[PDB]
Specification:
Chains A, B, C: It is found in: Host nucleus; Virion. 3 copies of one chain form a homotrimer. Chain A is mostly beta strands. Chain A is about 0% helix and about 55% strand. Chain A contains no helices and 12 strands. The complex binds chloride ion (12 copies). One chloride ion binds near residues 79, 80 and 131 of chain A.
Chain lengths: ~140, ~140, ~140
């Protein structure tokens, strides 16, 4: 086993940290600096938060693209996440799938796939929890 | 690779069995005594069933806490499950995320995150199937 | 680590290719010939497509069975997928769980579990993306 740490920058200047754990030809990647905790029987959490400005388009479509910048590519299979989308008028709490992909042009992306498009602008997306990311 | 078996007790006296498979610094945990089968082209299943009494609060909130007792901690990333919630008036079939966490006070918990809160009391939660639990 | 390739035939004559990666007693299986890509900032995809004719019953039930034929069994835990169901009147985009199981009679199946039954006939199911399949 070996480990590598890395990060990406979002368009608004946010930093996404990650840690890759390699066991043979499979890698498992976790995102840092967020998650659930139980503190004296009360659930608390720190989400990973994206702004509408971090998306290619801020409309709450059923496919969303977050272009990233950083030193290295990250290419994964999709993983399930619990996300909260804040619009001006609504709060949408939903399971989604997300996947790290690299564009043919070499740009890293995080892609989020949802069930239902809305004609509303994303103010925030909060990732509450996500299954680890697998790469073969 | 090595393997460890364990269990937890729920508040109502239910036993949750699990098996951990360790490969280097990643552990994969499966829960025992439940699942899907196909028998002469017909799907059958044995769910893992929790009572309302097993939850910290039995209200069908969008965050649920199941306090456990047992010999060892179990700390995992979240995994997706298909659950069935039975209330007095309704049956809710839904994908959820669940995660094993340990309280700062050392109490083991199973946490279930859902999309939509209901002002109803849980009679039962049936776990129909769940993706294996990963721990790094 | 070792690798094995295989395939299954569906009732309509479709071929499902898969690749198994074995690391000790855990196997990770990916399905071939489909997935997401980003091409100059635009998301494209090739789904894995099943016909209504591939199911045991074509009704859009909350449990679906796809009987397969091939040289070897494939038995997995459930994984989350984003699927699109096309009926004559509707398009349903949803997260589902799917699992490869073997019948007591030795027939391989792919089983799909959904949240909500509809009294409609499946024309197509498109698998857009699915988390890799784990077997212990
Ligand atoms: Cl952009
Ligand atoms: Cl977008
Ligand atoms: Cl997942
Ligand atoms: Cl808006
Ligand atoms: Cl309690
Ligand atoms: Cl609770
Ligand atoms: Cl999962
Ligand atoms: Cl009630
Ligand atoms: Cl059939
Ligand atoms: Cl069926
Ligand atoms: Cl999954
Ligand atoms: Cl129809």
């Amino acid at each position: 086993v070996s480990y590598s740490d890395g990060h990406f920058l979002t368009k608004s200047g946010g930093v996404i940290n990650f840690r890759k754990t390699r066991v043979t030809s499979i890698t498992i990647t976790i995102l840092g600096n967020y998650g659930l905790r139980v503190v004296n029987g009360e659930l608390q959490n720190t989400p990973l938060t994206f702004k509408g400005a971090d998306f290619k388009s801020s409309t709450l479509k059923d496919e969303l693209l977050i272009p990233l910048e950083g030193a290295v590519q990250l290419n994964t299979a999709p993983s399930t996440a619990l996300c909260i989308f804040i619009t001006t008028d609504h709060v949408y709490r939903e399971l989604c799938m997300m996947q790290f992909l690299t564009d043919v042009d070499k740009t890293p992306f995080l892609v989020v796939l949802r069930s239902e498009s809305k004609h509303e602008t994303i103010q925030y997306m909060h990732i509450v929890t996500v299954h680890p990311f697998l790469s073969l």
